[PDB]
Amino acid sequence: ATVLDSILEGVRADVAAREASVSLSEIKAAAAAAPPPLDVMAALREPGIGVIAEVKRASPSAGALATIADPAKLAQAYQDGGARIVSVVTEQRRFQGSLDDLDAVRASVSIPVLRKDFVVQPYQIHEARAHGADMLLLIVAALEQSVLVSMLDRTESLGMTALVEVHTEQEADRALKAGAKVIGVNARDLMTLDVDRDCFARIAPGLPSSVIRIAESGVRGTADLLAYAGAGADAVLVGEGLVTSGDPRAAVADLVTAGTHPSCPK
């Protein structure tokens, strides 16, 4: 039926294959020995609309959307441009990412790193931590509530911050009830990658001031950033559709300039 169901089937298979090689006990030990997590909440508390910039496999080879293909070099461009956090897509089927891309990014940047994947079981949480993630995406649509709560608790126990992704007002209610500190709204369709313009603006007013509100989709430049800031975004996640013109550093620097301007809408 849904694209999400197919992604999650994929996750279960891909995780089972990794777990056959590196057991749950072994990945828990690897997480426990990893360099400590970086301070995501401090990054998010910095003044101005923060930019989370995303590394993913597919982009146009030329034109206004052209960017850097190599994950380490892209991530470095993002850090150089002033991104507060670098996101790296590790889901393997819809987005053709890999845990190797997380490793490459982690070695390349000294700012916090978000592992952007579809978490369904604790193995993935320890694995994220072992491979250096500081922030972890959790998706309400993927999880039954009690499991969401236990994944959120495990993420936090390991010293990471959860970015809890919601697609509807009811999912936002669930994220709040689960205890989320950071709630992202994703309005992108998994088939087309098009973004519903009304979703953030509808959901965000229901999110209390005590949560950090993230626009996970739809911000492609300063024009969008200003619109989302006015709608209540505290940070924006950019990547898909970003107008980079071959120069992602500059594109991120322009977003930072706009988001930290004293007169930026809010």
| DSSP notation for the chain | --HHHHHHHHHHHHHHHHHHHS-HHHHHHHHHHSPPPP-HHHHHHSSS-EEEEEE-S---SSSTT----SHHHHHHHHHHHT-SEEEEE--SSSS---HHHHHHHHHH-SS-EEEES---SHHHHHHHHHTT-SEEEEEGGGS-HHHHHHHHHHHHHTTPEEEEEESSHHHHHHHHHHT-SEEEE--B-TTT--B-TTHHHHHGGGS-TTSEEEE-S---SHHHHHHHHHTT-SEEEE-TT---TT-HHHHHHHHHHHHTSTT---
| Distance of alpha carbon 34 from alpha carbon 242, whole angstroms | 33
| Distance of alpha carbon 41 from alpha carbon 96, whole angstroms | 29
Task: State the Cα torsion 67-73-78-80 to the nearest 10°.
Answer: -130
| Distance of alpha carbon 257 from alpha carbon 129, whole angstroms | 31
Resolution in angstroms comes to 1.3
Place of tokens 């670098």: 86
Give the contacts of 253 (CB within 8 A, at least 6 positions apart).
Answer: 81, 82
Please state the separation of Cα 161 from the chain's center in Å: 11
Angle at 59 between CA 6 and CA 65, to 5 degrees: 135
Expressed as residue numbers, the domain containing 187 is 1-266
Q: For the domain that residue 221 is a member of, what is the CATH number?
A: 3.20.20.70
Tokens, residue 114: 């978000």
Tokens, residue 14: 């891909």
Give the contacts of 211 (CB within 8 A, at least 6 positions apart).
Answer: 176, 180, 181, 182, 183
Domain count for the chain:
1
Per-residue burial over 105-115, b if 16 or more Cβ lie within 10 Å, else e, is bbebbebbbbb
| Distance of alpha carbon 136 from alpha carbon 127, whole angstroms | 11
- The catalytic residue positions are 54, 56, 116, 165, 186, 216-217
